[PDB]
Amino acid sequence: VGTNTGGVLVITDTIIVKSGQTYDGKGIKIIAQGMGDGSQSENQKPIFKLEKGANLKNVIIGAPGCDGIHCYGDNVVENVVWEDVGADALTVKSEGVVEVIGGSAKEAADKVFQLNAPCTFKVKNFTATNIGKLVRQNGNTTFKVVIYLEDVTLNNVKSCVAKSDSPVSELWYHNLNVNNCKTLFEFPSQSQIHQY
């Protein structure tokens, strides 16, 4: 809850958060129009583009989730709720540290989080329900990401919690609770998965 709770911002183009800015929604809900349908199609725009060092906080992203939130690194995404994930909820598009802290995501047909560049990706105090995967390192990429899942609770994970084809990436978990998931991690070695 914040001072904008009960308000909805209807957008027709991606919100760009410039480097060094924190976009604080104060509880506002964002609904994108003409930017996608939230399907898995690749002809959608992101709701948000966070330049390097931009932060986002306290927004609810309504359906359609479109192409979610494009992060160009060193971003904090705090108390963001994806009421219905689109193609994906958030994508790391450039190198850096990206932290998703608080909030939740719901109804991701595929992945919630998509890692397309080397990064440290931390998901903290987050719940997700009805998802295909929580985190996917871009398919067949072999750069390194380090994933931290800390105080993450997942419900109904169709594929796996996290998948990477990189032999060098790592996944660190601490209080990761997973209900209804056949396979936790799909990495080249279980030695890349660590508890802390």
Query: Given the rule CB under 5 A, which residues bind Ca ion?
Result: 67, 84-85, 87-88, 107
CA–CA separation, 55 vs 22, rounded Å?
4
- Contact criterion met (CB below 8 Å) for 161 and 178: yes
Q: Residue 78 binds which entry of Cl ion, Ca ion, none, with Cβ cut-offs from 5 to 8 Å by kind?
A: none
Q: Considering beta carbons, is residue 131 or 192 the nearer one to Ca ion?
A: 131
Strands of 79-144, DSSP E: 81-82, 90-92, 96-101, 104-115, 119-137
Q: Considering beta carbons, is residue 58 or 116 the nearer one to Cl ion?
A: 116
Interaction residues for Cl ion, span 85-124 (CB under 5 A): 93, 116
Q: Considering beta carbons, is residue 93 or 173 the nearer one to Ca ion?
A: 93
Classify strands 48-50 and 15-17 as parallel, antiparallel or unpaired: parallel
Can residue 44 be called a binding residue for Cl ion (CB under 5 A)?
Answer: no
With CB atoms as reference, the residue minimizing the distance to Cl ion is: 116
Selection from 131, 159, 126, 165 nearest residue 145 by Cα: 165
Binding site for Cl ion (CB under 5 A): 93, 116
